[PDB]
Design a protein around this ligand. Structure first.
Ligand code: CUZ
Ligand code: CUZ
Ligand code: CUA
Ligand code: CUA
Ligand SMILES: [Ca+2]
Ligand SMILES: [Ca+2]
Ligand SMILES: [Cl-]
Ligand SMILES: [Cl-]
Ligand SMILES: [Cl-]
Ligand SMILES: [K+]
Ligand SMILES: [K+]
Ligand code: NA
Ligand code: NA
Lengths: 586, 586
């Protein structure tokens, strides 16, 4: 298996890295591990103008006021248990959002603030029959309502909820109140069941209390029961949100019909569905084990045919210190990160199941040292029934001496490991910024991207509607529209000239500049920057972009094209002239 | 015969040989790479807002940024490392912001931006380079765009006698303005000699036009040479004016009715010249011809005669004008007597011998061109290791090309730049690595591993957060031990230590509308154990590395219980390293 990609060779897989608390998504080439693109999501990107342009702020909605995010879990939409390459979704733990990236244009095209929750952490996608729902965990217990009258996590109205977002429309589908809290989550290969780990069964706020119980649980959701109750109208709503809310809590030891709670030690973390669909596998973290939930025993569990919820556990292998996450090679082996032991341990799932029944068998196959303290890990296509067992990425949290010193703040170390053979082989150390937690890989042939924007793309359709209200045809017009103290400039662009090279406004006017790149040549992107006004954005071929700013400074103010586009790039400029307020009324 | 056969692979547990400091381009940051692996080791926020570390949100960063903290964007091009005696001394990195007219300084011991200045009375800081000898006393910065003085909206004519741009000198150590020199025309790139007396800058708009054709009209623009000693003499003697409300000494470097200033000479050079590069032997300022398929070589040792009036014609300091190819933009040096120039149109790097080009200029029939190497595609800057020092070592060359086209996996309409590593250690340039990068780094700079010395943990007296230490002192707080909430009207100042896995203050209560400052001191002494702080749904995020104090201010505008958490995976109990802010209503 080739590990080095030379000049003119292409990578075999795409990798989509979370940006961690930096807030973007990063597109890597695998196995070269080089970053091919950055996709801004919750960060403000000076380069493309994401967070500054009207198109991006419209997508972000009211949350456009935040300049930060904290993202952990990117996942690719699926059809029948295989990636279909349409969308990537990812969480924001810092401001409680889910974002959708359209994989044809590699941009964030939708974003939602999950109502009535704090901190979206775990996120995974329904597999079968396709990604109808995005499942998302709200991690922190809060009062409901959270109006500052009650603060006690022990109140009967303090809780967190499990969230289902409609993948296609990116609106809330439903929420399920749970006991405890929620950490990570995954879904089965039938569409009936999802599952989530919980570490705060104690509903405590301090360290000791959160560690009190020897077992917390994996909570299992019967999605068929939730849907049926939603169609029957058997639900409530919270606050101002119309989102159907179902109660998945136990009431006096009686299970709800939407959930079952399977006791699992201890403050368990990762929750990973095996690629053969047999198991939800929960990483024990404080317990040196993983717990294997047999998915084909879940119907019986939900029909009362099992005396004890532990009866769906068919394995609990002892692996090592600090198990956090598990992935799959498609050959019947599972790979689990041991954070404290700083290793990846490869183990055979059916043999672990044998050992649970007593048939003493050594299910552990290999322990590979990693550098150092691994969190998530990801084997190529591991979330699909096409898991190909070629590559494994272990994403470690301390790099220490593995890279040149760069000051007190160190990079992370995401290590590429060959798993095509029987022995795991460490091949490459990839330093990364801001702590990617998880990543997802896809074959090169599973992703199909556009090289030119479509002119009706919804990303900027609101801007086209604006232009229409002004009588503008964006493909041809270079016009300055005046409207009271608003000025709407529309121009085309074709290197090395802006279609409008100067315009005049009044001091204090609110200026919107809308630019359509009418070039057809791939890779010929233009930019637009207004000097000393904090204005910057990208316009790629056939895209329309716009940005609004206040002309608060009189005098002559240059704008220029930021994207090197032509030998005469330095000369693709224009001038905004701002007439002073003392020469205009008031 | 010596062949180019340097190793390019840096396997797990091996370390790179050189640091690379990349401009972040339109994205606004500085990036630290390892060479020859070309992996990004660290991101240093400068003009961007970084969600991960909180640069742009924290009080320490907004203090350094000053009033320009209101801007969320920057546009970088030219990173340069301070020198002593014509060799890198590893103290500081400087870089420009073309979008909002700033210069920033990065301290290479902590790899943080520690000072920032908005250059007064100019628009668009583009070209930037450092004094070399006797050390980097001055940062030289080009303001690209001609503007009226005053720019108060009375006069817009760029042909007005008070419309001009200025060459800028910043005190490298204080990061205060040293002086400004008014020039004719505009300014593109700049470099400095090896004595400290001279600096030079290309100018592409000798015609002071606003339109593309207008600024290409002159057969020749020029490189303007500055007699820095003479400027210093005038400043020391008080022979200067000031502009507007800036106390910066302003000297007039324009021609006056054909009469030369004492501070400048204009050397005619074809045509819209771009790069301005000092050869590592100190003999030449080399201007890349852009529209002219040439470079022009100015003999620095003829400049004293030029300013003394001994030379008949300013063209007499031109000692070579080799013809290289279409679209010369920039030049670098191997320390062996060869120059290497990017050919933007021909899409090549051309290697040529400077002394042979000088002899050809006299009429000798000698081919100074050694090799043309195809690059992919349209190169702008290029950089050979240690090229800006008298230690130029002739080992590595990076060419930073603006169109990557098919050299990487497609990632949608926006493509990465292609920064290509080229082995120049031998007689033949050899292309060895294609490096995709985001947002158009324009230029980069390499330093030997042993030229950079970094801190492993913060010093408690570090100037970076000295203002915060001063605030704490006013509140009577010992930041190394104290965990306290100070109430001051509707202001609340929380001070806490932190030690994984617990915040030193795990809950506090405020009134709705209070302005909350949270100051956190990481008292861990273990390298790499960084902590974070995020307030859920409040747009609040920051890094606290070992022995650092960081602080951030936000208004508690939402009643209820609001969780905060450590964003930096730091401990097996990371998930449980949390606290609660309780906000009382009404
Ligand atoms: Cu957010 S947690 Cu193991 Cu996923 Cu990193
Ligand atoms: Cu700003 S220009 Cu050839 Cu330096 Cu990139
Ligand atoms: Cu348009 Cu560069
Ligand atoms: Cu503190 Cu993770
Ligand atoms: Ca627990
Ligand atoms: Ca010109
Ligand atoms: Cl997981
Ligand atoms: Cl240059
Ligand atoms: Cl040579
Ligand atoms: K880390
Ligand atoms: K580009
Ligand atoms: Na939305
Ligand atoms: Na300053």
């Amino acid at each position: 298996q080739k590990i080095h990609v030379g000049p003119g060779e292409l990578d075999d897989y795409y990798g989509f890295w979370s940006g961690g608390h930096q807030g973007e998504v990063r597109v890597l080439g695998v196995p070269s591990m080089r970053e091919l693109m950055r996709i801004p999501v919750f960060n403000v990107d000076s380069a493309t103008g994401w967070g500054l342009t009207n198109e991006s702020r419209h997508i972000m909605g009211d949350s456009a006021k935040f300049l930060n995010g904290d993202c952990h879990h990117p996942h690719i939409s699926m059809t029948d248990g295989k990636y279909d390459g349409k969308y990537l979704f990812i969480n924001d733990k810092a401001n409680s959002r889910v974002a959708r990236i359209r994989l044809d244009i590699m941009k964030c095209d939708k974003m939602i603030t999950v109502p009535n929750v704090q901190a979206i952490h775990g996120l995974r996608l329904q597999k079968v029959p396709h990604t109808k729902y995005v499942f998302a965990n709200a991690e922190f217990i809060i009062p409901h309502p959270n109006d500052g009258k009650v603060f006690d996590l022990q109140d009967e109205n303090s809780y967190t909820m499990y969230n289902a977002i409609d993948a296609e429309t990116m609106e809330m589908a439903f929420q399920v109140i749970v006991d405890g809290n929620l950490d990570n989550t995954d879904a089965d290969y039938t569409g009936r069941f999802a599952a989530a780990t919980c570490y705060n069964s104690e509903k405590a706020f301090d360290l000791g209390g959160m560690m009190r119980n020897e077992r917390d649980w994996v909570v299992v959701f019967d999605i068929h029961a939730v849907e049926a109750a939603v169609k029957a109208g058997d639900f409530i709503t919270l606050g101002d949100s119309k989102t159907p809310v179902l109660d998945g809590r136990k009431k006096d030891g009686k299970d709800s019909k939407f959930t079952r709670y399977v006791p699992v030690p201890k403050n368990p973390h990762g929750c990973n569905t095996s690629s053969d669909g047999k198991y939800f596998i929960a990483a024990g973290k404080l317990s040196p084990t993983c717990s294997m939930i047999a998915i084909d025993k879940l119907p019986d569990l939900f029909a009362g045919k099992l005396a004890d919820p532990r009866d769906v556990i068919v394995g609990e292998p002892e692996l090592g210190l600090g198990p956090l996450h598990t992935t799959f090679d498609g050959r019947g082996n599972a790979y689990t990160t041991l954070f404290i032991d700083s290793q990846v341990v490869k183990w055979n799932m059916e043999e672990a199941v044998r050992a649970y029944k007593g048939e003493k068998v050594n299910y552990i196959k290999q322990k590979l040292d990693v550098h150092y303290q691994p969190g998530h890990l990801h084997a190529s296509l591991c979330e699909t029934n096409e898991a190909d067992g070629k590559w494994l990425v272990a994403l470690s949290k301390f790099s220490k001496d593995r890279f040149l010193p760069v000051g007190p703040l160190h990079p992370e170390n995401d290590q590429l490991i060959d798993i095509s053979g029987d022995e795991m082989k460490l091949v490459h150390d990839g330093p990364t910024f801001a702590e990617p937690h998880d990543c997802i890989m896809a074959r090169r042939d599973q992703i199909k991207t556009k090289k030119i924007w479509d002119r009706n793309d919804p990303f900027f359709a609101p801007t086209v509607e604006m232009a229409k209200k002004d009588g503008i045809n964006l493909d041809t017009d270079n016009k300055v529209i005046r409207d009271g103290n608003k000025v709407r400039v529309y121009m085309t662009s074709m290197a090395p000239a802006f279609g409008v090279q100067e315009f005049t406004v009044k001091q204090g006017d609110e200026v919107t500049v809308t630019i359509t790149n009418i070039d057809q040549i791939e890779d010929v992107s233009y930019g637009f920057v207004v000097v000393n006004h904090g204005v910057s954005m990208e316009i790629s071929p056939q895209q329309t972009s716009s940005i609004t700013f206040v002309a608060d400074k009189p005098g002559l103010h240059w704008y220029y094209c930021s994207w090197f586009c032509h030998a005469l790039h330095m000369e693709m400029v224009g001038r905004m002239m701002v007439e002073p307020a003392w020469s205009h009324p008031q």
